[PDB]
Amino acid sequence: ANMHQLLTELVNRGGSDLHLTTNSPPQIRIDGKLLPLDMPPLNAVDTKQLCYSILTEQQKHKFEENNELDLSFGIKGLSRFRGNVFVQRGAVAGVFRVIPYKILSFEELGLPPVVRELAEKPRGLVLVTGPTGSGKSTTLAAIIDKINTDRHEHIVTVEDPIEYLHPHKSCVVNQREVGADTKSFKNALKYILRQDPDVVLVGELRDLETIEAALTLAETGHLCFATLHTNSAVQTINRIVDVFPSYQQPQVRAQLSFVLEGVLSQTLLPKASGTGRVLAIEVMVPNPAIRNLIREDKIHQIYSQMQVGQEKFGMMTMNQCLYGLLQKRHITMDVGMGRSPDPDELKQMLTSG
Amino acid sequence: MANMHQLLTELVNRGGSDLHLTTNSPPQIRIDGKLLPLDMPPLNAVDTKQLCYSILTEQQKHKFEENNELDLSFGIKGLSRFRGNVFVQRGAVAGVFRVIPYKILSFEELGLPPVVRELAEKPRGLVLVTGPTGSGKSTTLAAIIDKINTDRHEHIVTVEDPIEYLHPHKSCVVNQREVGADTKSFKNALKYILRQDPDVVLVGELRDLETIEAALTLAETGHLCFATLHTNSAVQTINRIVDVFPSYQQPQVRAQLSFVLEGVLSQTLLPKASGTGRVLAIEVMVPNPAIRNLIREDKIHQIYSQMQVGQEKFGMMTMNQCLYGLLQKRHITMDVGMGRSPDPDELKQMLT
Amino acid sequence: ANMHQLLTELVNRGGSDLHLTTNSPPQIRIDGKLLPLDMPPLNAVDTKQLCYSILTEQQKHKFEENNELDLSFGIKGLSRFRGNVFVQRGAVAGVFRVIPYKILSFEELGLPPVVRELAEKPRGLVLVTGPTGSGKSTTLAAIIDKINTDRHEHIVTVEDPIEYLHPHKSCVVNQREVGADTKSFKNALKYILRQDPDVVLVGELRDLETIEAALTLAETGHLCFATLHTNSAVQTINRIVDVFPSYQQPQVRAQLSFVLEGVLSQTLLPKASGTGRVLAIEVMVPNPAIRNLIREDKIHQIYSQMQVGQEKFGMMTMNQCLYGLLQKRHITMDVGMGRSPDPDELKQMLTSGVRP
């Protein structure tokens, strides 16, 4: 009934987010969907006492000045949390995310064995892309945890915001949160070469400066991880090249062909059973043929190379993953078709074999 | 301050559309389109300020005094909600107040085609409801937001200036932020929206360059974004969005739009042929793979031809095709249907 | 007060403007031309004394901070006035414009009956154009007053500045003065749709933003009035189109062809008697043929349709109006010819075997 009990239940019930707003009971997001708790609806007095109970006095003043506040806090013996407090219809409202210290393993996440091998790469650019909540941070956290476990190197992450904490194991891990630890991605990236890193996570490739920063890191002997909100390997490569002026795109294509070591495009789909989510992932691992196609500006022909790189490189097109999920009845036909980038291709391959 | 409450009660009881308060005239109510003065003495400058200020918050009174303009909404328990505009004329306060029903109308009550219901089922993307002021945009948006609220277990956040339709929680969590009270501005609300775990976001009118980039970012990162524009057609809407950006960034914006656009609705309310009420005429564009290439290929005007043949497959409909059907079914007069066609000669060919 | 007496003489003598400046007697503008009053020339002491006699303490302080001041004021039993005070050659100077409360009728203004029929339009765009002091606000005030009399609708005006005041009749009339009631045309037009209007006066079509606002008003079921400074219907339509980029001119021409309901272009000419001025006006009322010519980018061919549209559509070219002013001997031959856009056509009209 208080903030401590709600946050403990959020962790205990495997929720990702707790929502507190007027005229609704506390609600928790489990596997992406909100489920209300068996409690009376809150009023404006309730949402204010609950949200204020986890703020410092200085934080309460800054929220009252702007009607907005981002913060993080810890509950001893429980978990860390990300909070956002705001105002709607004249009342306090809040959303609170658990940030787990412990990452589940690759097999628990449904990630193919090639993801474990990407975590062993000495150098290059590895891109994990997809929409919000498609599993990107969990894959990145699993990869970084394997690196942390296996290497004696320096890992620096720049995140907006940090979604997983990595205690030091064999690596030295420094994590900078945008907006608190560092002013911006640009400022962190301006000094990242002066911090003796070996592995760097740069977050979303939001602008040209960040793309150039990720390419330089990957060219100078570092393992660079970044995200995009693209849905396929080809769409990912096109977005990176096409954001640059036409005159500088030849160099970017040449740069990408040398340093790119893997592209993972994930999506979480509803299970046909109606409970839980299943991972759909497109995997592109560059071979000499794909690297030439990038340099030759034959980006779209990379898809044909992914269709035949399953046994050799662990590649898998998005349609090839949906096909396997369909034969095992993990997703319905309606969900698979609404997600296929080419439903006619997936339809024809289902009829044969 | 209790006189204003009684005037609005009289406005509701007499079936009026709008209440007018201005100096040197009695309160006037629009009934069936025509103004009628109430049998009361005329107001002075003190009165129009006193009545209008009685329904303002202290901030709203300081916001109004800073700009000599103010839009707002408020509710009267047991009566109705109302949208108000207060302004200044000849050195005195004036006000107009419209009626906002508590009960949100259905798709069929609003005259919205079944394709709007399928747009309400989209999991992510950008859906634009456009038109000039009072073209039914908030009513259409509320119907869309009410269907998602009814059907989904997701988090809906709206940013409104002001909040018009209220959406009680159903199966969704719905948070509605009013600019100038709950949040300082659209810019400030959008700065924090990514930390609030939203699934569906209403950002209001695409009023400037900065909000459009924010709306494209929300829709690109896996969210369903609703926004409005002032344009009157799908093609005019797409051109307006791209052309506000500097020439060097327009290639990316067209590329983003080809990926993220999920629907364009351009509405307009016309008087009914019976002489009572207004009926919705709507142009609906839902991008298919063909339209997405036309967007990427910068052949935006050829999109109109695609809408003419996408009715059965995709539920598409040009404005002229909608006006033709409303005219044949006797919902509108010939002058109103002709007075709205963007190409009156095309509608003639369909008439034959 | 001498100032009280000067303003009474200005009103009584039908002057439009009173001028007070150093080394000249007070001068009043009568029929567009300045005429000095039979008084000794004023000095700097006089001009500061006369202008300060009508200022509040707050106005005197603001004028002294900038050497500029706009204001309006009323004189009980006389008239209201719009004033401007400034400084020149180290001395105070002032100009004062009268704002009449009473609007003259259409026939008094010399406006043809077709203008009255334009006031009965339920929707569309009606443009009243001409140079400064060509009677535009006066024509607009007569139209607004007829609408106010005949309709139960909401009239909103946005003006820079307000020229005629309209007491309520059957309409509710709200008049917003730029720089006092509202910050700008842009802000008034930003909220005008939320103000439940039926008839809107938007002032000068100064930029694309205002033209786009008027087109939106005219398309959504409103009657919109606006002004330009063009001298003919064809010149008026082209001026509106040519303000847009070349790629967007097709749409603007298409919009105008749909919503345009009337174009009036005026000029005030001296009378043959030497007293008063007579209105010369060109009237274009769009028919289906003219609307097509607009859409087809055949604007110059619109004039030929106007030459034959008096009886059918109530149209009237400038030359046809000048012809009528010449037959009634209201203007001299030189004045009529000096304004004709085509003197040879007007000559042909005068040398007619069907002349009567």
Author numbering:
A (entry chain A): 2 to 354
B (entry chain F): 1 to 352
C (entry chain E): 2 to 357
Article passage:
PilT is the PilT/VirB11-like ATPase that powers T4aP depolymerisation. PilB is the ATPase that powers pilin polymerization in the T4aP. T4aP polymers can be rapidly depolymerized at the base, resulting in fiber retraction. Adjacent packing units adopt one of two conformations: open (O) or closed (C).
The three OCOCOC PilT structures described here are the only examples of PilT in this conformation determined to date. Nucleotide was absent in the methylated PilTGm structure, possibly due to the lengthy methylation protocol or competition with sulfate during crystallization. The isomorphic low-occupancy and high-occupancy ADP OCOCOC PilT structures have an RMSDCα of 0.6 Å per hexamer. The RMSDCα of these two structures with the methylated OCOCOC PilT structure is 1.9 Å per hexamer. Before symmetry was applied to this map, it more closely matched the methylated C3 symmetric structure of PilT than the pseudo-C3 symmetric structures, suggesting that the slight asymmetry of the latter is a crystallographic artifact.
